[PDB]
Amino acid sequence: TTTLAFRFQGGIIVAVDSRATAGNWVASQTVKKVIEINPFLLGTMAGGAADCQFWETWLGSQCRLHELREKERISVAAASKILSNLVYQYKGAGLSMGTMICGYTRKEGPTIYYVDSDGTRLKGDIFCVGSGQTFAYGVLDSNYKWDLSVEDALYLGKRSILAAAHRDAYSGGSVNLYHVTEDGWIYHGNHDVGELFWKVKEEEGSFNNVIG
Template sequence: MDTLVSKYANAASAASFDTADNLGENLAGWDAANEFALPAFDIPMVSNPVDFLRAHTDASAENRIRIQHGTTTLSFKFQGGIIVAVDSRASGGSYIASQTVKKVIEINPYLLGTMAGGAADCQYWERELGRRCRLYELRNKERISVAAASKILSNMVYDYKGMGLSMGTMITGWDKTGPQLFYVDSDGTRMRGERFSVGSGSTFAYGVLDTGYDYNLSVPDAIELGRRAIYHATHRDAYSGGSINVFHVKESGWEFIGNYDVGQLHWDYQAQPKGPIS
């Protein structure tokens, strides 16, 4: 990181940057034809390039850009299938980029993937997974299994291990063997499990999920458990928030249950009587 700072930032270059006051004046007289149609680039309005590079570059030589992210996603199996619940906030450090991000990617009518980590990495690789799953179906005349789909994703990202990918996803679905749930990350790690929570708020979600989890939960109770776990994570984790999207994976395919605003859920839960911890 210090090497990048010394290479690309110095006091002289900082002094030569246009200020917000004179930037418009300098650009007003610019003519593409007279300037040989050279491309123009917007320069970030930063007062100190040294501090800017130090804040946005990584100390690791392999990862030139420090990726800041936060989210909360969870999935768990129960007698009625699989519940998938996610928040919808996209953040980069203290900056909230969006409150309406769709963090569940529909790979096909029977397969879902969740997003945690870098949004671009998750969206690209899970869409690529969807393409390969479709090719498998066309070639073999049958649906791909959840295990095979998760293995394909794991193999793809493993080829880029150590190159700065940031991805922690859960692949869920229903195949010939029943409901299946796998965790896959950008290092190529692949694990089968009964319940997972991924993201900066996962520790808070696990506290609620582990307390209320029972394999024999009814469908309404399972939906409420997933929704409540994500709500508590958004309440305690500054990098999670927005609204909660809940999906139910069953034998006939996945079903979107609903979108719930965490602000409204806060007051709904606060109004409920508090009972003793059993």
């Protein structure tokens, strides 16, 4: 599992891999690790897949009830805290979650909260979670700037997942991209890692270690 999200000039990029495992066995290569909480909020999946799916879907219901009652879009701060307060009630029971609640509101601007099943809630600019997080961080940290274009940011997120997919045995399958704007998230496709690797190798001149 490799998932990342970073704030930039044009909003937020969210990028995830697609692999799920049960030990050495590759259970699925088609896993949807970005949960569409609603049209304006995104959540990432790391740790146990059921816990992330279930609770971030539930979060979408709580966000919907908030805006029905308050006649106003829920803040990313408030949404993330609903989830972190919930998992904190279950602390010790054995929930396994690492997630980033991503959104773009008027009052906050683009915002990312890392929420985690032992109760942690952190606001930040760049987050990477999963077995392949360190690989993705390497690419992100050396190439990140606030003034990236939407096109270049999308590629950086895609390239950072590819880096992890290559080295980390438990990451791969395909890359799912999202771009979060104030008017909502925009899906930027599913990209098979098998095809993407060779495409990137040739065009970029990287991965000279690998024969192609």
